[PDB]
């Protein structure tokens, strides 16, 4: 289960937002990163539409971000298996997104 905490933004689980990917009828695209789902429709085009970013659209992208990798088994809501100089790498990201998407909720597992 989760903790029904979503009243004004939400709560995905990682493998309902990989639903959130976009090419389904093109859903609403949602990238999360360490737990943080930003919204991603106004860079739709970039990741929901078989964009460069696809990797990241619908999908938790910390442990790739922090990898730099964009191979789908890495792409993964999972941060704690890696260190320090790999979690600076995903934080980089974090911050860029954080600066042009807005976190409307989390990601859950």
């Known amino acids: 289960m989760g903790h029904h905490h979503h009243h004004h933004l939400e709560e995905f689980t990682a493998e ?4 959130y990917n976009g090419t389904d009828e093109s859903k609403p695209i949602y990238v999360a990163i360490k737990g943080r789902v930003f919204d991603v429709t106004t860079g739709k085009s970039f990741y929901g539409s078989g964009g460069d970013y696809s990797m990241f659209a619908g999908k938790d992208a910390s442990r790739a ?3 730099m990798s964009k191979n789908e088994e890495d792409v993964s809501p999972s941060l704690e298996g890696l260190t320090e100089k ?3 790498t995903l ?3 974090e911050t860029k ?3 042009k998407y807005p976190v409307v909720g989390r990601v859950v597992s």
């Not at 309902?16 to 639903?19: C, D, K, P, T």
Request: net charge negative; glycine share 6%.
């Open 97 to 99: 997104f954080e600066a």
């Open 86 to 88: 790999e979690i600076n």
């Open 65 to 67: 971000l922090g990898k």
């Open 16 to 19: 309902q937002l990989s639903q």
């Open 91 to 93: 934080n980089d990201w």
